[PDB]
Design a protein around this ligand. Structure first.
Ligand SMILES: NC(=O)c1ccc[n+]([C@@H]2O[C@H](COP(=O)([O-])OP(=O)(O)OC[C@H]3O[C@@H](n4cnc5c(N)ncnc54)[C@H](OP(=O)(O)O)[C@@H]3O)[C@@H](O)[C@H]2O)c1
Ligand SMILES: COc1ccc2c(C(=S)N(C)CC(=O)O)cccc2c1C(F)(F)F
Length: 315
């Protein structure tokens, strides 16, 4: 079952390619290979600084008649320094021009935290705390709604919103469109049962990021657990004659989640897609869930400071 029905009436492929930390010199090839082997969903963001190169790949495959625009599902995200209502369209418009698209299938508020606007993506004070902006997320939501009504994006959603924050959008006075997606970190060490159950109960689809535990994250520490090297997970892989990565991708799929593993390695790209020919047992699923430890790749300690920091609450 390759696509899930969103509350805007559209269908979203449950496997997409992530692009965070995909180097600009390699990500054009990575996205071309991904399209060639089956992927139809690419997860992007202005802050990754590689959307132009992603867009070159998309356009080449459109031009080559490999894929049709309607069959692709291209996602990007509104960076934190653009939460002011006056900046949202332009932020979107940049992303469209870079990806060489005239609409996005899905546009997310990347983080609940607005940052001070300017050329800096990560503005810090003379002590290093992130400098917030005085933007209310409801007002940012209203600006996202306008994008739908302008034809620039087919669906809007959120990312890294905790339960109170999703609830805040859903109770927005005058809410016109419900979020379609909440994109959050999720893997056997951070299983998110409460937030996921809450979102699904509201008709919001959850996308799972860092499903392999982001071994290329720049802040990796030796003492950090490692999904890909966890002997318990390797064993489950071995019982199904798949790799560990394949188990880690199949796992959210069986929880009715969308999942976006990143790779710029052609063999891994292809491997990561071969996840529709096997099923984890109920016991496997329960077992993988038992590994939870509230471990986050994206803990973002410099943001703990911010009003809307989403991870003070477990969910
Ligand atoms: N919205 C948010 O706040 C947010 C935050 C973080 C991430 N995300 C999205 O989620 C995507 C995925 O998360 P991530 O990039 O943090 O990490 P990830 O997908 O968990 O892991 C990426 C790492 O795993 C490696 N890898 C890929 N396939 C592998 C395989 N089959 N075997 C062994 N290693 C493999 C990649 O190496 P190579 O590339 O060298 O092959 C890379 O080092 C991102 O790229 C981004 O699109 C969203
Ligand atoms: C909301 O705060 C964020 C959000 C994202 C980041 C990232 C990024 S771009 N990611 C974790 C990837 C992603 O957000 O998709 C890198 C470094 C600091 C960040 C911070 C930080 F505040 F720590 F600066």
């Amino acid at each position: 079952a390759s696509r899930i029905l969103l509350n805007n009436g559209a269908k979203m492929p449950i496997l997409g390619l992530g692009t965070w930390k995909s180097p600009p010199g390699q990500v054009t090839e990575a996205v071309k290979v991904a399209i060639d082997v089956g992927y139809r969903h690419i997860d992007c963001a202005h802050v990754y600084q590689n959307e132009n190169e992603v867009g070159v790949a998309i356009q080449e495959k459109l031009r080559e008649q490999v894929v049709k625009r309607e069959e692709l599902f291209i996602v990007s995200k509104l960076w934190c320094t653009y939460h002011e209502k006056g900046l949202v369209k332009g932020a979107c418009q940049k992303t469209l021009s870079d990806l060489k698209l005239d609409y996005l299938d899905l546009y997310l508020i990347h983080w609940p935290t607005g940052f001070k606007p300017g050329k800096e993506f990560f503005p810090l004070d003379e002590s290093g705390n992130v400098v917030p902006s005085d933007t209310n997320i409801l007002d940012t939501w209203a600006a996202m709604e306008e994008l739908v009504d302008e034809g620039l994006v087919k669906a809007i959603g959120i990312s890294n919103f905790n339960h109170l924050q999703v609830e805040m959008i859903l109770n927005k006075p005058g809410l016109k469109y419900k979020p379609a997606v909440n994109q959050i970190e999720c893997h056997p060490y951070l299983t998110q049962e409460k937030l996921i159950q809450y979102c699904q109960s509201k008709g919001i689809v959850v996308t799972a990021y860092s499903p392999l535990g982001s071994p290329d994250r720049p802040w990796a520490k030796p003492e950090d657990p490692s999904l890909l090297e966890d002997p318990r997970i390797k064993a489950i892989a071995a019982k199904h004659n798949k790799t560990t990565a394949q188990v880690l991708i199949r796992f959210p799929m069986q929880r009715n989640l969308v999942v976006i593993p990143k790779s710029v390695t052609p063999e891994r790209i292809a491997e990561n897609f071969k996840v529709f020919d096997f099923e984890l047992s109920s016991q496997d699923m329960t077992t993988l869930l038992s590994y939870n430890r509230n471990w986050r790749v994206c803990a973002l300690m410099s943001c703990t400071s911010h009003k809307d920091y989403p991870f003070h609450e477990e969910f």
